[PDB]
Amino acid sequence: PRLYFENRSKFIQDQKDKGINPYPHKFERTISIPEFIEKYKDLGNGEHLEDTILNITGRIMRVSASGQKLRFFDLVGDGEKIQVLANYSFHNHEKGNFAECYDKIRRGDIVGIVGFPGKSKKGELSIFPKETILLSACLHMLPMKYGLKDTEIRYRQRYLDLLINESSRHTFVTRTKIINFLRNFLNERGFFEVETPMMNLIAGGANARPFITHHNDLDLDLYLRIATELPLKMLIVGGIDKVYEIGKVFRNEGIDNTHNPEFTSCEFYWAYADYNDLIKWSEDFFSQLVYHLFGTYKISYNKDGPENQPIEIDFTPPYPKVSIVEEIEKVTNTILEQPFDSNETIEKMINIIKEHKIELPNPPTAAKLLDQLASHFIENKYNDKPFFIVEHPQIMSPLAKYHRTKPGLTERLEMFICGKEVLNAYTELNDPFKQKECFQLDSAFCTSLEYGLPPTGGLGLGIDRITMFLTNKNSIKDVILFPTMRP
Amino acid sequence: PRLYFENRSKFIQDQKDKGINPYPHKFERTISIPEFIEKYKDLGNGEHLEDTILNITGRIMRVSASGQKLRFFDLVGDGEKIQVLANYSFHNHEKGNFAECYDKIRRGDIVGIVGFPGKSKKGELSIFPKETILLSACLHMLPMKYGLKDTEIRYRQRYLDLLINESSRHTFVTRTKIINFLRNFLNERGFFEVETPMMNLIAGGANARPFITHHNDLDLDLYLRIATELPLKMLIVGGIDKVYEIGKVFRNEGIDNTHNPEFTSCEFYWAYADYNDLIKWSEDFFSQLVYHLFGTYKISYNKDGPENQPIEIDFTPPYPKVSIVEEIEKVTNTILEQPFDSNETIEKMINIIKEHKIELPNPPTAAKLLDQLASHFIENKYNDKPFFIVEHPQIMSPLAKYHRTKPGLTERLEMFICGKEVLNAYTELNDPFKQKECFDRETEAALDSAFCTSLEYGLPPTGGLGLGIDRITMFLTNKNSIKDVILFPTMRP
Numbered sequence: 001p002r003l004y005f006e007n008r009s010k011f012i013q014d015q016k017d018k019g020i021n022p023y024p025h026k027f028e029r030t031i032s033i034p035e036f037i038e039k040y041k042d043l044g045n046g047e048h049l050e051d052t053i054l055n056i057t058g059r060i061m062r063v064s065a066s067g068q069k070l071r072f073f074d075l076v077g078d079g080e081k082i083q084v085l086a087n088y089s090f091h092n093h094e095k096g097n098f099a100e101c102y103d104k105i106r107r108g109d110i111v112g113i114v115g116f117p118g119k120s121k122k123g124e125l126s127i128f129p130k131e132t133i134l135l136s137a138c139l140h141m142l143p144m145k146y147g148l149k150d151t152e153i154r155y156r157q158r159y160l161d162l163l164i165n166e167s168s169r170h171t172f173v174t175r176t177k178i179i180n181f182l183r184n185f186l187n188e189r190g191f192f193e194v195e196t197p198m199m200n201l202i203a204g205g206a207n208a209r210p211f212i213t214h215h216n217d218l219d220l221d222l223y224l225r226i227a228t229e230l231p232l233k234m235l236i237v238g239g240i241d242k243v244y245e246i247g248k249v250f251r252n253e254g255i256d257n258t259h260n261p262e263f264t265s266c267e268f269y270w271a272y273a274d275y276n277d278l279i280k281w282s283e284d285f286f287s288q289l290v291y292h293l294f295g296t297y298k299i300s301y302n303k304d305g306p307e308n309q310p311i312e313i314d315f316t317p318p319y320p321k322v323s324i325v326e327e328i329e330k331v332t333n334t335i336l337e338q339p340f341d342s343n344e345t346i347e348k349m350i351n352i353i354k355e356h357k358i359e360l361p362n363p364p365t366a367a368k369l370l371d372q373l374a375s376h377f378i379e380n381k382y383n384d385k386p387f388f389i390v391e392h393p394q395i396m397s398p399l400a401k402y403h404r405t406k407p408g409l410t411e412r413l414e415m416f417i418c419g420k421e422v423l424n425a426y427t428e429l430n431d432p433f434k435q436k437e438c439f440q441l442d443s444a445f446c447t448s449l450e451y452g453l454p455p456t457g458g459l460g461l462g463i464d465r466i467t468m469f470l471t472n473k474n475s476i477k478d479v480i481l482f483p484t485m486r487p
Numbered sequence: 488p489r490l491y492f493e494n495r496s497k498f499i500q501d502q503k504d505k506g507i508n509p510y511p512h513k514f515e516r517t518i519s520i521p522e523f524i525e526k527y528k529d530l531g532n533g534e535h536l537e538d539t540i541l542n543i544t545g546r547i548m549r550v551s552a553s554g555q556k557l558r559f560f561d562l563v564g565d566g567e568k569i570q571v572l573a574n575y576s577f578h579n580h581e582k583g584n585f586a587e588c589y590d591k592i593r594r595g596d597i598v599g600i601v602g603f604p605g606k607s608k609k610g611e612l613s614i615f616p617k618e619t620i621l622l623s624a625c626l627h628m629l630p631m632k633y634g635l636k637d638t639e640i641r642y643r644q645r646y647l648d649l650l651i652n653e654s655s656r657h658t659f660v661t662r663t664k665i666i667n668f669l670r671n672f673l674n675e676r677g678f679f680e681v682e683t684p685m686m687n688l689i690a691g692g693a694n695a696r697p698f699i700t701h702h703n704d705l706d707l708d709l710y711l712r713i714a715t716e717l718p719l720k721m722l723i724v725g726g727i728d729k730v731y732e733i734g735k736v737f738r739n740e741g742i743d744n745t746h747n748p749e750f751t752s753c754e755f756y757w758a759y760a761d762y763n764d765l766i767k768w769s770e771d772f773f774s775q776l777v778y779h780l781f782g783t784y785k786i787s788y789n790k791d792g793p794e795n796q797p798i799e800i801d802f803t804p805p806y807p808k809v810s811i812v813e814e815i816e817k818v819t820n821t822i823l824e825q826p827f828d829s830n831e832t833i834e835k836m837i838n839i840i841k842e843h844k845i846e847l848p849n850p851p852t853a854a855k856l857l858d859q860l861a862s863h864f865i866e867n868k869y870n871d872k873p874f875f876i877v878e879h880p881q882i883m884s885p886l887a888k889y890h891r892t893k894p895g896l897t898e899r900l901e902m903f904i905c906g907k908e909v910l911n912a913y914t915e916l917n918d919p920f921k922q923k924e925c926f927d928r929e930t931e932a933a934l935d936s937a938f939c940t941s942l943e944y945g946l947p948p949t950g951g952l953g954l955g956i957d958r959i960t961m962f963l964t965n966k967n968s969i970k971d972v973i974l975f976p977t978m979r980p
C-alpha cells in the first residue's frame with residue numbers, strides 16, 4: 001500500500017540519524033552500462049577480470065537473495081541491463097557488514113558499485129561488487145509492467161513509463177531521430193533555421209482559436225502563434241531565400257487522438273520554388289526518412305490498436321495525387337460549379353451532407369462544407385500509401401497563389417497518412433493586390449508583400465503525427481513526453 | 488511619398504491589362520548568385536562565355552544611368568552581389584523593345600534573367616542578359632546603404648534591415664551558428680534533445696512572474712513556462728541520464744536591453760555529475776565556441792556602445808571563481824553571520840546598502856538583500872574575462888543541493904560576461920525531504936506536486952545548467968541590446 005512509502009521515509013531518517021548520507025553529492029564512475037556491455041560481452045563463461053576495478057552506476061530493477069551469501073540484482077542504465085553478483089567472498093568487510101548493507105537495497109534504488117566485471121558460470125554478463133553505496137532511494141513501490149499497461153500514469157508520470165516500458169524510450173528516441181533527420185535534411189539543402197516570435201498581436205498563418213495572454217509591462221493582450229507562416233514569409237522578403245523553423249505552435253481547439261493544444265510544427269519557405277517542387281520534396285523526404293529508420297520503404301501500422309490486425313504502408317515514390325473538388329464531384333455525381341460561396345452550390349453541398357447525414361459544420365460556410373465533404377469522401381481513400389489532396393479552391397486557401405490554368409483553385413497540396421493530414425504546402429500568394437483581406441492577417445505582413453515577395457513555395461509539417469505513424473501509435477499523447485491532461 | 492507607391496500600383500495594373508503577368512508562378516533558375524560568383528570569379532577581364540546560357544535571379548539594388556545601348560544594374564541574392572550588364576547587341580528582340588523592357592525596372596524589383604556570364608574589362612563579374620522578366624515588384628522606395636539607423640524600423644521591419652544592412656544578416660547567421668554549435672556540442676557527448684510543455688498549471692524552475700492564459704474547451708487556466716528545469720529533472724528520474732532542450736521560455740517582467748519577455752534558453756541535465764563537472768563544461772564550451780567563431784579566444788566588445796572604445800574579452804580558460812558571501816564580506820569589511828534571515832544579519836545588510844547609497848528591495852527579504860549586494864559589489868568585478876559567482880546561500884537557491892562542506896551554501900555557479908549573467912548551474916537537490924516546498928513567503932517564488940512526487944522515485948546525483956542563448960549571441964555579435972539578436976522583438980505599437 002502506502003505504508004511502504006512511510007517506512008522508506010523512516011528508513012531515510014534512520015540513516016541520517018546514524019551518520020550516513022543517503023544522497024551523496026558525487027560518485028565518479030569509470031564506465032556506463034552500455035559501454036560495459038560492449039566492452040565485456042565477448043568474455044568467456046565463468047571468466048573474471050578481478051584485476052579490473054570499475055565504478056558503475058544504475059537503477060536496481062529486481063532483487064533476489066539466494067541463500068544469504070549470494071545476492072543477485074538487475075542494474076539498468078540508458079535502456080540497457082546487466083546483472084550484479086554480490087558475493088560475500090568479494091566484499092570489503094571493513095566498510096560494512098555484508099548482509100546488513102545488501103538487505104537495505106530495494107527495487108528502484110539508484111546505487112554506485114565498485115567491483116570487477118565477469119560472467120556467471122551460465123554466461124550472464126555481470127558486475128561483481130566489492131562495495132555498493134546507495135545514491136538515491138526510490139521511496140515508492142516501483143510498479144512492474146502491470147499497472148502501466150493502459151492508465152493515465154504513463155501520461156501523468158512519464159518517468160515511470162520510461163523506466164518500466166522498454167517501448168516508450170525507443171518511441172521518444174525515434175522522435176528525436178526524426179527531428180534530427182529533418183533538420184539535417186533542410187540544412188543539407190542550404191536552408192537557414194530561425195526563431196520567430198510565439199507571442200504576437202495577431203494570430204495568422206491558419207485559422208483556429210488562439211490563446212490569449214497579457215503582457216504586464218507593455219499593458220497589452222498578445223496571442224500565442226497558431227503558425228509560423230507570416231513572419232517566415234517576411235524573412236523571404238528580407239532575402240533569406242531558404243528559411244525554416246521547428247517549434248511549438250498553439251491552437252485553442254479540441255483535444256482528441258490527433259490534436260494537442262500545443263504541438264510541434266515545421267514550416268520552411270523556399271524562394272523560386274512552386275508546388276511541383278513541393279511535391280518532389282515531400283516524396284523525397286518521407287521516403288528517405290522512412291528508409292533512414294527502417295532500412296526499407298514499407299512499414300507496418302496498427303491503425304486500430306495492437307488488438308487489431310495491422311496494415312502495411314508503402315512509402316515508395318511517387319504518391320497518388322487527387323484533386324479535391326473534382327474527386328468530390330466524381331464520388332457524389334454532383335457538379336459544384338463556381339462560385340463555391342454561391343447559395344446554389346452551398347445548397348447542393350448541404351443536400352449531400354443531408355443525404356448521407358454527415359456532420360453539419362458549425363458555421364455552414366462553403367470553405368467548411370468543402371472540408372467536411374473531403375473528410376468523408378477522399379481523406380480515407382488510400383490507406384496502403386500516402387497520397388496528396390491537391391488543387392484546393394481559393395476560398396479554402398487565402399494565402400495560396402491562384403492555380404495558373406484552373407480558375408478558382410490554388411496550387412495547394414496536403415499529404416495524408418492513414419486518413420490523417422501530416423502536411424500542408426502550396427505555391428505562395430505573393431501579389432499584395434490579390435490578398436484582398438489586407439484592406440486574421442497583419443498589416444505588417446501586407447506591407448512587406450508590397451516590398452516584393454519572390455515566387456515562393458512553402459510547406460508545413462506536423463511532426464507529432466509523423467512520429468505516431470513511424471512509432472506505431474494511435475494517439476498523439478503517446479509521442480509527447482508530457483501531454484496536457486485534466487487534473 | 489504615397490505618390491511613389493501609387494505609381495507602382497497603377498503600373499502593376501497597367502501591365503496586367505496589357506497581358507504581361509508581373510507575378511509569374513514559376514521561374515526555373517540554373518544557378519544561385521553565390522554559386523555564380525564562385526564558379527566564374529577567376530575569368531580574365533573581358534571574358535564572354537556567350538554560349539553558356541544560364542537562368543539567374545535576384546533583387547535589383549542599384550539602377551545606373553541609362554547609356555541608351557548599355558544598362559547597368561546591381562543584382563543581389565543570399566547577401567552577395569553581381570553586376571547586370573544589359574547590352575543592346577545581346578538583347579533578344581523577339582520578346583519586346585529593348586528600352587521599354589528595361590525602363591520599367593525599378594530598384595528593389597526581383598527579376599529573372601536569361602543570359603551568359605562574363606567580366607567587364609575593368610574586373611567586374613557581370614551577367615549579360617538576353618531577356619529580363621519581372622518576377623515580383625517592390626512598390627515602395629527602399630532606404631539607401633547608410634540610411635536605416637532609425638532602428639524602430641529595423642525592429643518592426645526586419646526585412647528592410649536584412650536587405651540594406653550587411654551586418655544584420657551576419658548577426659543572425661552567427662546566432663544560428665551558435666545554436667548549431669551548442670546542439671552538436673551536447674549531441675557529441677551523448678546528450679538527448681527533448682521537448683517539454685510550454686503550458687503548465689504551475690510555473691516553477693525560477694523566480695519570475697508568469698504569463699497566464701486559458702484553454703477554452705478544457706476550461707482551465709494555464710501558465711507559460713518560465714524555465715525547463717522541473718520536467719527535465721523528471722526525465723532524469725525516467726532514466727534519460729543526459730537530456731536537454733533548446734527553446735523559448737516566458738517571463739512576464741520588464742523589457743530593457745538584456746531582457747525580452749520571451750527569450751531562448753537551453754537547459755541540460757547530467758546524471759552523476761556535479762558542480763565541478765559543470766564548471767569545466769562551461770569553460771570547455773565557451774572557449775571552444777568563441778574559438779570556433781573567431782579563430783581566437785579574445786574578442787572585442789563595445790560594452791559602452793559603438794561611440795566608445797571597446798574592450799577585449801579573453802575566453803581563455805580557466806575563468807576566476809568568486810564566492811558571493813565571502814567577497815561581499817571582503818569588499819564591505821563586514822562579516823554576515825548565519826542564519827542570513829537573522830534579524831541582526833538583516834540589520835547590518837540593510838545598513839551596508841544604505842552606507843553605499845543603494846536601492847532597497849521592495850520586499851526586504853534576506854535573499855533579495857544578498858541579491859542587491861551581489862550586483863553592486865561583485866557582478867562587475869571582472870570585465871576583461873568571463874567569471875563565476877559561486878557557492879550561493881541556500882536561501883537564494885531553493886533547488887540547488889546544499890554545499891557538502893560549507894553549511895548554509897549551495898554548489899551553485901553563475902557565469903557573468905561584462906556584468907550580465909549568461910549561465911546558471913548547480914548540483915541538483917535530489918533529496919525530496921530537503922525540498923522544503925514538498926512538505927512560501929506571502930510573489931515571484933516557487934512548488935509542483937508532480938515534480939515533488941517524481942523526486943520520491945529517486946533522482947540520481949545530477950548537475951544541471953542553463954544558458955541564456957540571446958545574451959551569449961549579443962556578446963559574440965557585438966550588440967548592446969537583446970533586440971539586435973531577436974529577428975522580431977516584442978514591441979509596443
Ligand SMILES: C[C@H]1CCC[C@H]([C@@H](O)[C@H]2Cc3cc(O)cc(O)c3C(=O)O2)O1
Binds near residue numbers: 208260262460
Ligand atoms: C502545421 C500543420 C501542417 C499540416 C499537418 C499538421 C496539421 O494537421 C496539424 C493540425 C492540428 C491542430 C490542432 O489543434 C492540434 C494538433 O495537434 C494538430 C496537428 O497535430 O496537426 O501540422
Ligand SMILES: C[C@H]1CCC[C@H]([C@@H](O)[C@H]2Cc3cc(O)cc(O)c3C(=O)O2)O1
Binds near residue numbers: 695741745746748753
Ligand atoms: C535561462 C537563464 C540562465 C542563464 C542566464 C539567463 C538569464 O539571465 C535570463 C534572465 C532573463 C529574464 C527575462 O525576464 C528576460 C530575459 O531575456 C532574460 C535573459 O535573457 O536571461 O538565462
Ligand SMILES: N[C@@H](CCCC[NH3+])C(=O)O
Binds near residue numbers: 461
Ligand atoms: N501555416 C500552414 C503551413 C504552411 C503552408 C504553406 N504556406 C499550416 O498551418 O498548415
Ligand SMILES: N[C@@H](CCCC[NH3+])C(=O)O
Binds near residue numbers: 692713715716754913
Ligand atoms: N532553470 C534555471 C537554471 C538552472 C540550471 C539547472 N537546472 C533558470 O532559469 O535560471
